[PDB]
Amino acid sequence: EAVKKWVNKIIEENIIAVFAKTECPYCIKAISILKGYNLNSHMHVENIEKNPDMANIQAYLKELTGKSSVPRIFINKDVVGGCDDLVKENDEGKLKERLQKLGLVN
Ligand SMILES: [Cs+]
Ligand SMILES: [Cs+]
Ligand SMILES: [Cs+]
Ligand SMILES: [Cs+]
Ligand SMILES: [Cs+]
Ligand SMILES: [Cs+]
Ligand SMILES: [Cs+]
């Protein structure tokens, strides 16, 4: 219960929520893509490796998204997925549409 409530708070209190780990190139790439949209004011990055309950967190993220791997990316509580998913959305215009509907980009 405690771990799920903690993850839920991160997802629900930040429009852009990224679960990451230490020295994680696709985490770094995904976060940098998001910051390139000037999203930092509404972003939260949680390093779940530096956490005693990493496995519980990962299992819950898999229950929510289908994968336990990081990065795990949510936008307004909707599942984006990993960095490859973000790259697909970015390249195909979906990421910008998402952010426009939230008022985060013009
Ligand atoms: Cs920037
Ligand atoms: Cs951009
Ligand atoms: Cs931030
Ligand atoms: Cs532990
Ligand atoms: Cs939503
Ligand atoms: Cs783009
Ligand atoms: Cs706005």
XYZ file of all heavy atoms in Angstrom, unseen atoms left out:
830
model
N 0.832 -1.196 0.000
C 0.000 0.000 0.000
C 0.871 1.253 0.000
O 0.653 2.164 -0.795
C -0.943 0.005 1.207
N 1.863 1.280 0.895
C 2.708 2.461 1.049
C 3.442 2.795 -0.244
O 3.464 3.955 -0.679
C 3.703 2.242 2.187
N 4.058 1.791 -0.872
C 4.812 2.042 -2.098
C 3.893 2.536 -3.208
O 4.226 3.480 -3.940
C 5.576 0.775 -2.521
C 6.218 0.981 -3.873
C 6.617 0.426 -1.475
N 2.732 1.895 -3.368
C 1.799 2.329 -4.405
C 1.334 3.760 -4.163
O 1.263 4.559 -5.103
C 0.607 1.372 -4.486
C 0.964 -0.010 -5.046
C -0.266 -0.865 -5.390
C 0.160 -2.148 -6.129
N -0.951 -3.058 -6.577
N 1.031 4.111 -2.909
C 0.595 5.478 -2.613
C 1.694 6.492 -2.919
O 1.416 7.599 -3.407
C 0.160 5.582 -1.152
C -1.117 4.832 -0.827
C -1.357 4.807 0.677
C -2.748 4.290 1.026
N -3.000 2.922 0.487
N 2.952 6.119 -2.660
C 4.086 7.007 -2.921
C 4.289 7.237 -4.423
O 4.457 8.385 -4.886
C 5.326 6.389 -2.272
C 6.609 7.117 -2.429
C 7.084 8.131 -1.645
C 7.620 6.858 -3.407
N 8.324 8.529 -2.090
C 8.673 7.764 -3.172
C 7.730 5.957 -4.470
C 9.820 7.789 -3.957
C 8.854 5.985 -5.245
C 9.895 6.891 -4.984
N 4.261 6.153 -5.206
C 4.341 6.288 -6.661
C 3.163 7.105 -7.189
O 3.326 7.989 -8.044
C 4.404 4.898 -7.320
C 4.241 5.015 -8.820
C 5.713 4.207 -6.973
N 1.956 6.810 -6.701
C 0.783 7.540 -7.155
C 0.939 9.026 -6.896
O 0.551 9.843 -7.734
C -0.473 7.022 -6.459
C -0.926 5.666 -6.978
O -0.418 5.162 -7.980
N -1.897 5.068 -6.287
N 1.478 9.397 -5.729
C 1.647 10.816 -5.421
C 2.583 11.478 -6.413
O 2.331 12.608 -6.857
C 2.184 10.998 -4.005
C 1.167 11.585 -3.046
C -0.131 10.824 -3.139
N 3.675 10.795 -6.770
C 4.579 11.384 -7.763
C 3.859 11.606 -9.090
O 4.015 12.658 -9.731
C 5.826 10.502 -7.938
C 6.673 10.546 -6.666
C 6.626 10.934 -9.185
C 7.828 9.553 -6.662
N 3.076 10.619 -9.528
C 2.406 10.710 -10.829
C 1.311 11.769 -10.809
O 1.081 12.474 -11.801
C 1.833 9.339 -11.226
C 2.955 8.313 -11.400
C 0.995 9.447 -12.506
C 2.436 6.913 -11.633
N 0.591 11.872 -9.701
C -0.592 12.716 -9.656
C -0.271 14.151 -9.288
O -1.038 15.051 -9.648
C -1.624 12.125 -8.673
C -2.174 10.770 -9.116
C -3.234 10.206 -8.182
O -2.864 9.638 -7.132
O -4.445 10.344 -8.493
N 0.851 14.411 -8.617
C 1.133 15.777 -8.202
C 2.059 16.505 -9.173
O 2.248 17.717 -9.039
C 1.676 15.773 -6.755
C 0.652 15.103 -5.779
C 0.972 15.241 -4.283
O 2.155 15.428 -3.920
O 0.023 15.150 -3.458
N 2.580 15.813 -10.184
C 3.421 16.402 -11.217
C 2.835 16.070 -12.579
O 2.581 14.898 -12.871
C 4.842 15.866 -11.130
C 5.414 16.007 -9.754
O 5.845 17.088 -9.371
N 5.391 14.921 -8.984
N 2.632 17.089 -13.419
C 2.087 16.809 -14.744
C 3.004 15.865 -15.506
O 2.546 14.900 -16.130
C 1.848 18.112 -15.525
C 0.808 18.971 -14.806
C 1.379 17.789 -16.955
C 0.455 20.237 -15.551
N 4.312 16.119 -15.470
C 5.296 15.268 -16.138
C 6.066 14.504 -15.072
O 6.792 15.110 -14.272
C 6.271 16.074 -17.006
C 5.534 17.084 -17.894
C 7.163 15.121 -17.822
C 4.714 16.461 -18.973
N 5.959 13.177 -15.087
C 6.599 12.351 -14.070
C 7.484 11.318 -14.746
O 7.010 10.552 -15.587
C 5.564 11.657 -13.189
N 8.761 11.286 -14.366
C 9.730 10.359 -14.942
C 10.372 9.559 -13.817
O 10.942 10.137 -12.886
C 10.815 11.086 -15.752
C 11.769 10.069 -16.361
C 10.185 11.936 -16.829
N 10.285 8.242 -13.907
C 10.993 7.347 -13.007
C 12.256 6.881 -13.707
O 12.198 6.401 -14.846
C 10.091 6.178 -12.618
C 8.881 6.613 -11.855
C 7.721 6.978 -12.519
C 8.919 6.716 -10.472
C 6.609 7.419 -11.803
C 7.803 7.151 -9.755
C 6.655 7.497 -10.422
N 13.396 7.052 -13.037
C 14.699 6.853 -13.663
C 15.603 6.101 -12.700
O 15.202 5.728 -11.596
C 15.318 8.199 -14.065
N 16.845 5.915 -13.117
C 17.846 5.277 -12.283
C 19.190 5.954 -12.532
O 19.301 6.841 -13.370
C 17.891 3.762 -12.480
C 18.592 3.268 -13.728
C 18.639 1.750 -13.722
C 19.038 1.187 -15.070
N 18.472 -0.171 -15.287
N 20.204 5.537 -11.791
C 21.523 6.140 -11.904
C 22.192 5.750 -13.216
O 22.097 4.601 -13.656
C 22.394 5.701 -10.729
O 21.626 5.757 -9.514
C 23.611 6.589 -10.616
N 22.874 6.712 -13.841
C 23.731 6.449 -15.006
C 22.986 5.645 -16.077
O 23.391 4.554 -16.489
C 25.022 5.737 -14.589
C 25.909 6.553 -13.667
C 27.020 5.741 -13.030
O 27.300 4.613 -13.495
O 27.619 6.242 -12.057
N 21.879 6.222 -16.525
C 20.903 5.542 -17.371
C 20.756 6.345 -18.654
O 19.995 7.328 -18.683
C 19.569 5.440 -16.632
S 18.123 4.954 -17.605
N 21.459 5.976 -19.730
C 21.474 6.845 -20.924
C 20.104 7.156 -21.502
O 19.873 8.293 -21.933
C 22.327 6.043 -21.917
C 23.245 5.249 -21.049
C 22.450 4.886 -19.820
N 19.196 6.183 -21.569
C 17.881 6.494 -22.125
C 17.021 7.300 -21.160
O 16.170 8.076 -21.618
C 17.181 5.211 -22.581
C 17.806 4.695 -23.861
C 18.714 3.655 -23.829
C 17.524 5.289 -25.096
C 19.318 3.194 -24.980
C 18.133 4.833 -26.266
C 19.026 3.779 -26.194
O 19.650 3.290 -27.316
N 17.267 7.196 -19.845
C 16.686 8.156 -18.906
C 17.145 9.569 -19.228
O 16.338 10.502 -19.302
C 17.082 7.825 -17.463
S 16.649 6.191 -16.853
N 18.459 9.745 -19.374
C 19.032 11.062 -19.620
C 18.515 11.630 -20.933
O 18.113 12.799 -21.007
C 20.568 10.967 -19.592
C 21.016 10.550 -18.180
C 21.200 12.284 -20.058
C 22.484 10.190 -18.063
N 18.486 10.803 -21.982
C 17.936 11.249 -23.258
C 16.476 11.679 -23.124
O 16.091 12.746 -23.625
C 18.086 10.141 -24.304
C 17.622 10.525 -25.711
C 17.687 9.316 -26.634
C 17.039 9.586 -27.991
N 17.965 10.294 -28.903
N 15.636 10.850 -22.482
C 14.216 11.183 -22.369
C 14.010 12.474 -21.590
O 13.202 13.331 -21.981
C 13.461 10.036 -21.697
N 14.726 12.624 -20.476
C 14.560 13.819 -19.660
C 15.029 15.044 -20.424
O 14.427 16.120 -20.331
C 15.306 13.647 -18.329
C 14.585 12.611 -17.470
C 15.421 14.974 -17.596
C 15.476 11.952 -16.433
N 16.093 14.898 -21.214
C 16.590 16.032 -21.980
C 15.612 16.430 -23.080
O 15.412 17.625 -23.329
C 17.965 15.703 -22.548
O 18.910 15.646 -21.496
N 14.978 15.452 -23.731
C 13.937 15.770 -24.712
C 12.817 16.561 -24.044
O 12.369 17.596 -24.557
C 13.405 14.489 -25.377
C 14.465 13.898 -26.320
C 12.077 14.764 -26.126
C 14.117 12.515 -26.825
N 12.371 16.102 -22.871
C 11.294 16.811 -22.171
C 11.716 18.226 -21.763
O 10.944 19.182 -21.916
C 10.834 16.004 -20.955
C 10.097 14.720 -21.357
C 10.063 13.704 -20.226
C 8.693 15.048 -21.846
N 12.931 18.389 -21.235
C 13.376 19.730 -20.871
C 13.541 20.628 -22.086
O 13.452 21.855 -21.949
C 14.683 19.661 -20.083
C 14.510 18.966 -18.741
C 15.663 19.217 -17.806
C 15.353 18.664 -16.425
N 16.494 18.822 -15.484
N 13.777 20.049 -23.269
C 13.838 20.846 -24.485
C 12.512 21.465 -24.888
O 12.492 22.356 -25.743
N 11.404 20.984 -24.324
C 10.113 21.645 -24.431
C 9.862 22.627 -23.284
O 8.730 23.100 -23.128
C 8.989 20.606 -24.477
C 8.791 19.958 -25.830
C 9.420 18.762 -26.152
C 7.957 20.530 -26.773
C 9.233 18.168 -27.395
C 7.763 19.946 -28.011
C 8.406 18.762 -28.313
O 8.218 18.172 -29.540
N 10.891 22.940 -22.492
C 10.781 23.905 -21.394
C 9.755 23.451 -20.359
O 8.985 24.252 -19.823
C 10.450 25.305 -21.918
C 10.673 26.382 -20.876
O 11.691 26.387 -20.182
N 9.717 27.293 -20.753
N 9.755 22.155 -20.066
C 8.782 21.547 -19.168
C 9.256 21.452 -17.725
O 8.525 20.914 -16.897
C 8.421 20.140 -19.667
C 7.802 20.104 -21.066
C 7.520 18.668 -21.492
C 6.539 20.956 -21.117
N 10.438 21.977 -17.391
C 11.028 21.650 -16.094
C 10.139 22.083 -14.933
O 10.117 21.414 -13.892
C 12.406 22.289 -15.954
C 13.142 21.812 -14.711
O 13.271 20.608 -14.475
N 13.619 22.753 -13.905
N 9.393 23.181 -15.089
C 8.574 23.668 -13.983
C 7.509 22.655 -13.584
O 7.059 22.654 -12.430
C 7.922 25.008 -14.336
O 7.101 24.899 -15.487
N 7.113 21.773 -14.505
C 6.070 20.778 -14.249
C 6.605 19.359 -14.354
O 5.831 18.417 -14.562
C 4.892 20.980 -15.208
C 4.097 22.210 -14.914
N 3.256 22.302 -13.827
C 4.026 23.405 -15.549
C 2.709 23.504 -13.799
N 3.151 24.188 -14.837
N 7.914 19.188 -14.201
C 8.544 17.884 -14.262
C 9.029 17.460 -12.886
O 9.466 18.285 -12.083
C 9.737 17.893 -15.209
C 9.381 17.778 -16.647
S 10.897 17.959 -17.612
C 11.687 16.386 -17.324
N 8.954 16.159 -12.631
C 9.613 15.554 -11.485
C 10.313 14.290 -11.946
O 9.687 13.443 -12.593
C 8.617 15.211 -10.386
C 9.254 14.517 -9.227
N 9.828 15.202 -8.179
C 9.447 13.202 -8.971
C 10.327 14.338 -7.313
N 10.110 13.117 -7.771
N 11.601 14.167 -11.630
C 12.368 12.963 -11.930
C 12.694 12.286 -10.610
O 13.305 12.901 -9.725
C 13.653 13.275 -12.703
C 14.450 11.977 -12.921
C 13.327 13.946 -14.035
N 12.291 11.024 -10.482
C 12.554 10.223 -9.294
C 13.540 9.124 -9.658
O 13.259 8.312 -10.547
C 11.262 9.617 -8.749
C 11.430 8.938 -7.382
C 11.647 9.933 -6.254
O 11.092 11.053 -6.329
O 12.389 9.611 -5.291
N 14.680 9.085 -8.964
C 15.661 8.018 -9.148
C 15.268 6.869 -8.230
O 15.451 6.945 -7.010
C 17.077 8.510 -8.847
C 18.142 7.407 -8.984
O 17.852 6.213 -8.941
N 19.387 7.824 -9.146
N 14.727 5.805 -8.817
C 14.197 4.711 -8.013
C 15.245 3.657 -7.692
O 14.968 2.748 -6.890
C 12.985 4.072 -8.712
C 13.406 3.343 -9.994
C 11.900 5.134 -8.975
C 12.339 2.400 -10.522
N 16.455 3.806 -8.220
C 17.533 2.875 -7.899
C 18.058 3.220 -6.500
O 18.355 2.341 -5.703
C 18.655 2.929 -8.925
C 19.814 2.014 -8.577
C 20.828 1.896 -9.691
O 20.714 2.635 -10.683
O 21.739 1.062 -9.567
N 18.201 4.515 -6.240
C 18.583 5.027 -4.926
C 17.338 5.065 -4.040
O 16.828 6.116 -3.649
C 19.227 6.401 -5.053
C 20.608 6.371 -5.669
N 16.853 3.862 -3.717
C 15.614 3.689 -2.979
C 15.628 2.274 -2.430
O 15.995 1.352 -3.169
C 14.400 3.902 -3.890
C 13.106 4.024 -3.119
O 12.633 3.059 -2.524
N 12.510 5.214 -3.150
N 15.245 2.060 -1.173
C 15.273 0.692 -0.631
C 14.216 -0.215 -1.237
O 14.320 -1.446 -1.105
C 15.028 0.904 0.867
C 14.272 2.185 0.940
C 14.795 3.045 -0.176
N 13.208 0.343 -1.894
C 12.095 -0.439 -2.419
C 12.051 -0.424 -3.941
O 10.970 -0.431 -4.534
C 10.772 0.059 -1.850
C 10.760 0.073 -0.336
O 11.225 -0.914 0.266
O 10.274 1.060 0.249
N 13.223 -0.440 -4.588
C 13.278 -0.351 -6.047
C 12.444 -1.436 -6.717
O 11.714 -1.165 -7.681
C 14.725 -0.449 -6.535
C 14.839 -0.281 -8.047
S 16.490 -0.662 -8.642
C 16.392 0.057 -10.280
N 12.571 -2.679 -6.253
C 11.835 -3.772 -6.884
C 10.326 -3.587 -6.755
O 9.577 -3.860 -7.704
C 12.264 -5.108 -6.285
N 9.855 -3.136 -5.587
C 8.422 -2.885 -5.439
C 7.971 -1.792 -6.393
O 6.923 -1.906 -7.040
C 8.078 -2.481 -4.003
C 8.492 -3.514 -2.964
O 9.241 -3.191 -2.033
N 7.989 -4.747 -3.088
N 8.756 -0.716 -6.484
C 8.424 0.382 -7.388
C 8.354 -0.120 -8.823
O 7.396 0.167 -9.545
C 9.437 1.533 -7.239
C 9.382 2.112 -5.820
C 9.158 2.629 -8.266
C 10.621 2.919 -5.417
N 9.362 -0.883 -9.251
C 9.401 -1.386 -10.623
C 8.225 -2.298 -10.911
O 7.639 -2.241 -12.000
C 10.700 -2.145 -10.872
C 11.907 -1.250 -11.038
C 13.147 -2.046 -11.387
O 13.862 -2.500 -10.507
N 13.397 -2.229 -12.684
N 7.876 -3.162 -9.958
C 6.742 -4.056 -10.175
C 5.449 -3.266 -10.310
O 4.614 -3.574 -11.170
C 6.637 -5.070 -9.039
N 5.280 -2.214 -9.491
C 4.089 -1.378 -9.636
C 4.088 -0.639 -10.972
O 3.038 -0.516 -11.621
C 3.981 -0.399 -8.470
C 2.703 0.421 -8.487
C 1.483 -0.162 -8.812
C 2.719 1.769 -8.170
C 0.312 0.583 -8.823
C 1.553 2.521 -8.169
C 0.357 1.924 -8.507
O -0.807 2.674 -8.503
N 5.248 -0.131 -11.401
C 5.299 0.529 -12.700
C 4.979 -0.449 -13.823
O 4.388 -0.059 -14.835
C 6.665 1.181 -12.920
C 7.018 2.352 -11.991
C 8.490 2.729 -12.152
C 6.122 3.561 -12.244
N 5.340 -1.723 -13.662
C 4.955 -2.708 -14.671
C 3.450 -2.956 -14.645
O 2.818 -3.106 -15.700
C 5.734 -4.009 -14.471
C 5.558 -4.996 -15.614
C 6.407 -6.244 -15.440
C 6.301 -7.121 -16.678
N 7.166 -8.325 -16.586
N 2.851 -2.994 -13.453
C 1.404 -3.152 -13.384
C 0.697 -1.980 -14.047
O -0.371 -2.155 -14.650
C 0.944 -3.295 -11.931
C 1.376 -4.595 -11.273
C 1.098 -4.615 -9.779
O 0.387 -3.705 -9.297
O 1.578 -5.548 -9.094
N 1.294 -0.792 -13.978
C 0.670 0.398 -14.560
C 0.922 0.537 -16.058
O 0.050 1.041 -16.783
C 1.182 1.655 -13.856
C 0.761 1.867 -12.401
C 1.374 3.158 -11.868
C -0.741 1.879 -12.265
N 2.090 0.107 -16.542
C 2.537 0.428 -17.897
C 2.882 -0.774 -18.761
O 3.022 -0.602 -19.980
C 3.770 1.343 -17.862
O 4.906 0.588 -17.421
C 3.553 2.519 -16.933
N 3.053 -1.963 -18.189
C 3.466 -3.129 -18.936
C 4.954 -3.403 -18.929
O 5.367 -4.475 -19.394
N 5.776 -2.481 -18.426
C 7.213 -2.713 -18.345
C 7.718 -2.262 -16.985
O 7.213 -1.292 -16.417
C 7.988 -1.956 -19.436
C 7.690 -2.414 -20.848
C 8.702 -1.823 -21.815
C 8.352 -2.170 -23.250
N 9.116 -1.314 -24.198
N 8.746 -2.960 -16.482
C 9.396 -2.610 -15.223
C 10.644 -1.758 -15.417
O 11.264 -1.354 -14.426
C 9.805 -3.874 -14.460
O 10.602 -4.717 -15.283
N 11.047 -1.512 -16.662
C 12.301 -0.834 -16.952
C 12.148 0.670 -16.812
O 11.060 1.226 -16.962
C 12.769 -1.171 -18.365
O 11.752 -0.871 -19.315
N 13.272 1.335 -16.563
C 13.303 2.796 -16.562
C 14.057 3.258 -17.804
O 14.959 2.552 -18.291
C 13.926 3.358 -15.270
C 12.988 3.120 -14.083
C 15.315 2.781 -15.025
N 13.734 4.433 -18.351
C 12.758 5.366 -17.782
C 11.303 4.935 -17.966
O 10.977 4.196 -18.902
C 13.032 6.658 -18.549
C 13.569 6.188 -19.872
C 14.406 4.988 -19.541
N 10.506 5.317 -17.030
C 9.023 5.161 -17.121
C 8.377 6.679 -17.057
O 8.642 7.548 -16.135
C 8.484 4.307 -16.003
C 7.466 3.292 -16.469
C 8.065 1.958 -16.884
N 8.685 1.927 -18.191
C 8.056 1.729 -19.342
N 6.757 1.567 -19.384
N 8.749 1.689 -20.459
N 7.630 6.998 -18.090
C 7.210 8.380 -18.307
C 5.690 8.460 -18.314
O 5.030 7.745 -19.081
C 7.775 8.928 -19.629
C 9.301 8.763 -19.676
C 7.320 10.380 -19.839
C 9.855 8.827 -21.091
N 5.147 9.349 -17.471
C 3.730 9.680 -17.417
C 3.557 11.159 -17.729
O 4.361 11.991 -17.288
C 3.128 9.401 -16.027
C 3.290 7.982 -15.569
C 4.505 7.533 -15.072
C 2.225 7.106 -15.618
C 4.656 6.218 -14.650
C 2.366 5.798 -15.183
C 3.581 5.354 -14.714
N 2.495 11.489 -18.461
C 2.139 12.879 -18.734
C 0.660 13.059 -18.390
O -0.209 12.444 -19.021
C 2.433 13.279 -20.190
C 3.952 13.262 -20.442
C 1.823 14.652 -20.487
C 4.387 13.767 -21.823
N 0.380 13.897 -17.389
C -0.978 14.083 -16.866
C -1.641 12.746 -16.542
O -2.804 12.510 -16.878
C -1.842 14.893 -17.830
C -3.117 15.404 -17.172
O -3.149 15.670 -15.977
N -4.178 15.508 -17.952
N -0.881 11.862 -15.888
C -1.277 10.531 -15.438
C -1.471 9.542 -16.580
O -1.740 8.362 -16.319
C -2.535 10.563 -14.558
C -2.329 11.419 -13.311
C -3.627 11.696 -12.588
C -4.388 12.816 -13.251
N -5.595 13.202 -12.471
N -1.325 9.970 -17.833
C -1.378 9.050 -18.962
C -0.014 8.410 -19.172
O 1.022 9.055 -19.000
C -1.804 9.780 -20.241
C -3.221 10.323 -20.172
O -4.100 9.669 -19.574
O -3.455 11.422 -20.722
N -0.015 7.133 -19.555
C 1.239 6.414 -19.781
C 1.815 6.782 -21.145
O 1.207 6.498 -22.185
C 1.032 4.898 -19.679
C 2.324 4.185 -20.025
C 0.564 4.520 -18.289
N 2.991 7.417 -21.142
C 3.764 7.536 -22.369
C 4.589 6.281 -22.580
O 4.555 5.666 -23.655
C 4.654 8.788 -22.339
C 5.550 8.810 -23.570
C 3.791 10.044 -22.286
N 5.317 5.870 -21.546
C 6.114 4.663 -21.654
C 7.590 4.916 -21.421
O 7.967 5.548 -20.435
N 8.449 4.425 -22.314
C 9.878 4.604 -22.189
C 10.393 5.660 -23.147
O 9.632 6.396 -23.783
N 11.721 5.735 -23.247
C 12.315 6.731 -24.134
C 11.970 6.459 -25.596
O 11.722 7.399 -26.357
C 13.829 6.774 -23.934
S 14.664 8.144 -24.806
N 11.971 5.191 -26.019
C 11.597 4.899 -27.402
C 10.172 5.349 -27.692
O 9.892 5.888 -28.769
C 11.737 3.411 -27.697
C 13.160 2.938 -27.618
O 14.056 3.778 -27.382
O 13.367 1.720 -27.777
N 9.250 5.119 -26.748
C 7.885 5.606 -26.929
C 7.862 7.126 -27.047
O 7.128 7.690 -27.872
C 7.005 5.178 -25.753
C 6.844 3.677 -25.642
O 6.592 2.983 -26.666
O 6.968 3.179 -24.502
N 8.645 7.803 -26.208
C 8.688 9.260 -26.249
C 9.231 9.751 -27.579
O 8.714 10.715 -28.143
C 9.540 9.792 -25.093
C 9.538 11.317 -24.958
C 8.198 11.830 -24.437
C 10.697 11.813 -24.076
N 10.284 9.109 -28.085
C 10.857 9.473 -29.379
C 9.838 9.291 -30.490
O 9.737 10.126 -31.394
C 12.139 8.664 -29.643
C 12.580 8.787 -31.112
C 13.263 9.148 -28.712
N 9.067 8.201 -30.451
C 8.041 8.007 -31.475
C 6.997 9.122 -31.414
O 6.636 9.711 -32.444
C 7.380 6.633 -31.314
C 6.236 6.358 -32.290
C 5.620 4.974 -32.050
C 4.424 4.697 -32.957
N 4.693 4.952 -34.392
N 6.524 9.443 -30.201
C 5.539 10.514 -30.043
C 6.105 11.861 -30.478
O 5.419 12.662 -31.126
C 5.063 10.587 -28.590
C 4.123 9.457 -28.166
C 3.328 9.820 -26.924
O 3.332 11.008 -26.552
O 2.699 8.919 -26.325
N 7.364 12.125 -30.134
C 8.000 13.381 -30.512
C 8.112 13.494 -32.025
O 7.734 14.512 -32.620
C 9.381 13.458 -29.849
C 9.992 14.838 -29.931
O 9.291 15.848 -29.865
N 11.311 14.889 -30.075
N 8.622 12.444 -32.671
C 8.832 12.487 -34.113
C 7.524 12.583 -34.885
O 7.495 13.174 -35.974
C 9.606 11.249 -34.564
C 11.075 11.314 -34.201
O 11.474 12.231 -33.446
O 11.831 10.444 -34.674
N 6.442 12.005 -34.363
C 5.205 11.915 -35.123
C 4.208 12.995 -34.736
O 3.080 13.002 -35.246
C 4.615 10.504 -34.988
C 5.514 9.500 -35.729
C 5.167 8.033 -35.525
O 4.220 7.723 -34.781
O 5.863 7.191 -36.141
N 4.625 13.944 -33.900
C 3.814 15.087 -33.549
C 2.926 14.896 -32.343
O 2.321 15.874 -31.885
N 2.841 13.676 -31.809
C 1.921 13.385 -30.711
C 2.350 14.069 -29.420
O 1.500 14.557 -28.664
C 1.818 11.869 -30.515
C 1.083 11.408 -29.248
C -0.315 12.009 -29.136
C -1.085 11.425 -27.955
N -1.259 9.948 -28.071
N 3.654 14.117 -29.142
C 4.112 14.749 -27.905
C 3.724 16.221 -27.876
O 3.239 16.734 -26.858
C 5.625 14.597 -27.762
C 6.248 15.201 -26.501
C 5.561 14.692 -25.239
C 7.737 14.883 -26.469
N 3.939 16.923 -28.989
C 3.598 18.338 -29.017
C 2.098 18.550 -28.825
O 1.693 19.453 -28.087
C 4.085 18.980 -30.314
C 3.865 20.492 -30.352
C 4.507 21.129 -31.574
C 4.294 22.638 -31.570
N 5.508 23.396 -31.994
N 1.279 17.697 -29.434
C -0.173 17.789 -29.279
C -0.540 17.605 -27.811
O -1.334 18.359 -27.269
C -0.884 16.749 -30.140
C -0.617 16.913 -31.623
C -1.438 15.969 -32.477
O -1.322 14.741 -32.290
O -2.199 16.460 -33.333
N 0.060 16.616 -27.175
C -0.186 16.370 -25.782
C 0.099 17.597 -24.965
O -0.703 18.002 -24.189
C 0.754 15.337 -25.253
C 0.241 13.984 -25.010
C 1.284 13.165 -24.288
N 1.313 11.807 -24.757
C 0.453 10.884 -24.406
N -0.476 11.172 -23.572
N 0.543 9.679 -24.861
N 1.257 18.189 -25.201
C 1.653 19.336 -24.397
C 0.799 20.559 -24.698
O 0.547 21.373 -23.803
C 3.130 19.641 -24.629
C 4.063 18.485 -24.280
C 5.485 18.849 -24.662
C 3.986 18.121 -22.792
N 0.343 20.701 -25.943
C -0.509 21.825 -26.302
C -1.834 21.751 -25.564
O -2.329 22.769 -25.065
C -0.741 21.845 -27.814
C 0.426 22.391 -28.622
C 0.205 22.287 -30.122
O -0.342 21.298 -30.616
N 0.626 23.311 -30.853
N -2.414 20.551 -25.463
C -3.698 20.431 -24.775
C -3.590 20.730 -23.283
O -4.592 21.096 -22.657
C -4.283 19.037 -25.000
C -4.528 18.707 -26.468
N -2.403 20.595 -22.706
C -2.166 20.909 -21.304
C -1.791 22.369 -21.087
O -1.628 22.794 -19.939
C -1.069 19.987 -20.751
C -1.411 18.497 -20.839
C -0.190 17.632 -20.576
C -2.541 18.131 -19.874
N -1.676 23.149 -22.158
C -1.241 24.527 -22.038
C 0.232 24.690 -21.747
O 0.664 25.778 -21.359
N 1.020 23.636 -21.929
C 2.433 23.675 -21.577
C 3.303 24.223 -22.691
O 4.408 24.705 -22.417
C 2.922 22.277 -21.199
C 2.285 21.689 -19.937
C 2.636 20.220 -19.824
C 2.770 22.460 -18.729
N 2.837 24.148 -23.935
C 3.508 24.764 -25.071
C 2.444 25.468 -25.899
O 1.280 25.058 -25.928
C 4.293 23.734 -25.922
C 5.220 22.896 -25.043
C 3.348 22.841 -26.700
N 2.841 26.553 -26.551
C 1.924 27.296 -27.404
C 1.531 26.463 -28.621
O 0.433 26.594 -29.162
C 2.552 28.616 -27.843
Cs 15.622 24.210 -22.115
Cs 11.207 21.212 -28.386
Cs 11.776 20.198 -11.657
Cs 15.658 -3.057 1.209
Cs -5.577 11.850 -17.764
Cs 9.374 17.100 -33.125
Cs -1.059 28.446 -21.100
